[model samples]
Structures are given as structure tokens and as C-alpha cells.
Target: MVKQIESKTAFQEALDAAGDKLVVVDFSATWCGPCKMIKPFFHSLSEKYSNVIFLEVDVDDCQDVASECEVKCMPTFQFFKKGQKVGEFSGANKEKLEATINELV
Candidate 1:
């Protein structure tokens, strides 16, 4: 399931809940065209990758979390492990996203 991060506290909780598994956080914006285009694809990945924890965050709604993460672009996929950012990329590339997850998982 793709969990929606609503606040900084929720983000911390989700990160802790992810345990030892990989956490993929999709930092996006409502007004971003690329973010809208990749929404379904990102959600679909959650179904395909059971070993990874999927999360989504709207930059506008969760400004504090987004700012803390240093999200300067929409559709930024950040990979985390043990609450530390391990990898990340900013774009709507399905292949790259899948490949990154595949490599990590």
C-alpha cells in the first residue's frame, strides 16, 4: 500500500514502521504536471514491490517535511534505509524508478 504522509510526525512514524525494508518516498506537488503524470505509476509500484514500503507526500500539504528533505523539484523519489537517505532522483521516469527499486530491493 502507498501511505500518504500528512505531516512531519506521520513521516517519522512511517519511517519507523518501515523497519529494515526499503522506504520509497515520493515527494511531489499538486501543481506539477510531471507529478500528476507519475502518480498512478508510483502507486502501481507499491503493488509490484512487496518488500519495499511506498509513501507519497504532497509538498504543499507537508511543507515542513518537504523542506526538511530538501525537495526542490516535483516527483522526487527518495530512497531511505534506517531513516537515512540512501538514494534519490527527481523526475517521472518509470524505468529509472523501477530500476532503482530493483537495485535496492
Candidate 2:
């Protein structure tokens, strides 16, 4: 499920929704440069991994998630497996991101 988050409420909801598995979150913003660069990859990954719960959170509109995830940069990626954060990345690199998600499996 590619759930889009608007606030901390949404983040918590998605985390709960993930059940016992992992949820991949892409913390992004419209005005962010890296966010744009990685947006396509995120979208592609969403479809590529049907077993994974994929979601995007816009930090500009949802400040809660940004602060909750300690997101200081654009395109922060967080992986939560078993309802706990197991991995994350705050910079560029698609291979590492995909490899991280594959680790959940």
C-alpha cells in the first residue's frame, strides 16, 4: 500500500497499518531538490515491491512527521519492520535504498 502521509497522525496510522511487517516512508517536500530527484525512484519502488508498504510524507505540509523522524533534509527514507524503525537514509543513492528494503524480506 502506497499510503501518503499528511501529518503525524497519518504516520502513526500507517505504522499501525503495517501490522507485523515493514513500512517504507519517503519523507519529501515539493520545494526540495533531492526530493524531486528521488521521487521517481520512490514511485517505481512502490510498484516494484508489492509486498512492502510504501508511503510518502510531505514535510512542508506535515511538520509532525518531519520532527518525528528527525528529518533535517529532503528525501529522508525510513524503514520500519515489525512496527519499529530498522533502517533509514537521508541522502542520494538508489541501490542502497533498494537493498535496505530487500533486507526486510
Candidate 3:
């Protein structure tokens, strides 16, 4: 399941506990059109990439998490390896997202 971070504290705990798993964070807002469009794809990724940790943070629900991650745009995909950011991109680009996951995983 794609874990929905409820607060920055939870995000921190999850980040710290991720260990060797690749962490994939989806920073998005409820009202974002593109975010809505790619929601299913993101969920599918969670299922497809079982080795990775999939997390979702709503920019509105978890403002601090969003700000701390420096997410300036909706639908931003941030990839972390060993609790360190290794790759990131914005938009609903499935190909790029898949490629990044492939490269990292």
C-alpha cells in the first residue's frame, strides 16, 4: 500500500526507517488536475514496485512535509535511496517515472 504521511513527524520516522529500500514520495494536492490524472498510475507503481517504499503527502494536509521537501509544484516525484535524495522530477510523465524507478531499483 502507498503510505499516506499524516505529518512531518511521520515522514521523518518513515524516512529514517526506510533503510535500504528506495523511497518514492509523491507530493501532490487534492485540487491539482494533473495530480488527479496520475493518481492511478502512482498507485499502480506502488503495486508494481514492491521493493520500493511508496509514500504520499498531500501539500495541503501535510504542509510542513511539503515545504521541508521543497516541493514547489504539484505532482512532484522524489526518489530517495538510503534516506538520501537520489532522483526527482515533476509532472505526470509515466515513462520518466518508470525509468527512474528502473534505474534506482
Q: Please report, in order, the local distance difference test score of every candidate based on alpha carbons.
A: 0.93, 0.83, 0.91
User: Which scores higher on TM-score, 1 or 2?
Assistant: 1
| Candidate 3 runs further than 4 Å off | none
Clashing pairs in 1: none
Error of 2 at 17 (Å): 1.3
Q: Highest lDDT among the candidates is held by which one?
A: 1
Please write out the lDDT profile of model 2 over residues 1-105, one tens digit for every residue. 467777777678778877877788888889878788988888898888888899888888888768867999778888888778888888767998899888876
Ranking the candidates on TM-score from highest down gives 1, 3, 2
Q: What is the lDDT of residue 62 in candidate 3?
A: 91
- Alpha-carbon deviation at 57 in model 1, angstroms: 0.7
Please estimate how well model 3 matches the true structure, expressed as its whole-model Cα lDDT: 0.91
Number of the predicted model whose TM-score against the real structure is largest: 1
Cα lDDT of model 3 by residue, 1-101, tens digit: 69999988898899999899999999999999999999999999999888899999999999888878899988999999877899999998889988999
* Ten residues in sequence with the least summed lDDT for candidate 1: 66-75
In model 1, the Cα lDDT at residue 8 comes to 94
lDDT of 3 at 2: 96
